[PDB]
Design an enzyme around this catalytic site. Structure first.
Site, PDB file in Angstrom:
ATOM      1  N   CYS A  36      53.710  90.572   0.729  1.00 32.16           N
ATOM      2  CA  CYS A  36      54.482  91.490   1.554  1.00 32.16           C
ATOM      3  C   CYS A  36      53.816  92.874   1.717  1.00 32.16           C
ATOM      4  CB  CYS A  36      55.889  91.606   0.960  1.00 32.16           C
ATOM      5  SG  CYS A  36      56.957  92.738   1.821  1.00 32.16           S
ATOM      6  N   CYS A  39      56.001  95.794   0.881  1.00 33.44           N
ATOM      7  CA  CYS A  39      56.086  95.840  -0.588  1.00 33.44           C
ATOM      8  C   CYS A  39      54.917  96.583  -1.227  1.00 33.44           C
ATOM      9  CB  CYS A  39      56.171  94.432  -1.174  1.00 33.44           C
ATOM     10  SG  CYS A  39      57.732  93.628  -0.791  1.00 33.44           S
TER      11      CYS A  39
END
Length: 110
Positions: A36, A39
């Site tokens: 991600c 992230c």
């Protein structure tokens, strides 16, 4: 010691969650994933919050490692930050919203 604790098993997650509940500390879980991009961007920020708020517990849960924990918490976008007090979910921030996360930590701690 103002560090993010990476929880690699449900047992690891549960012991830190219990410690938080028992000691009356706010627990903030970063439900994250190695794949991600968002992230990755927020990761060092979450680490810096851990240092800034040594009185709260900062957990990192990789959703592909703990699929059952992510499922139990209904995580449906990444990253998702859950805020836990007395063992129970009390708030959430979906996405790498730096200011929202800071605001919520400060507000929920006092």
């Amino acid at each position: 010691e103002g560090a993010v604790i990476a929880c690699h098993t449900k047992q690891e997650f549960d012991t830190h969650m219990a410690n938080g509940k028992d000691t009356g500390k706010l627990v903030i879980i970063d439900f994250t994933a190695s794949w991600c991009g968002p992230c990755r961007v927020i990761a060092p920020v979450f680490a810096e919050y851990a240092k800034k708020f040594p009185g709260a517990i900062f957990l990192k849960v990789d959703v592909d490692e703990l699929k059952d924990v992510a499922e139990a918490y209904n995580v449906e976008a990444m990253p998702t930050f859950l805020f836990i007090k007395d063992g129970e979910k009390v708030d959430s921030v979906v996405g790498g919203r730096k200011d929202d996360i800071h605001t919520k930590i400060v507000a929920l701690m006092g």
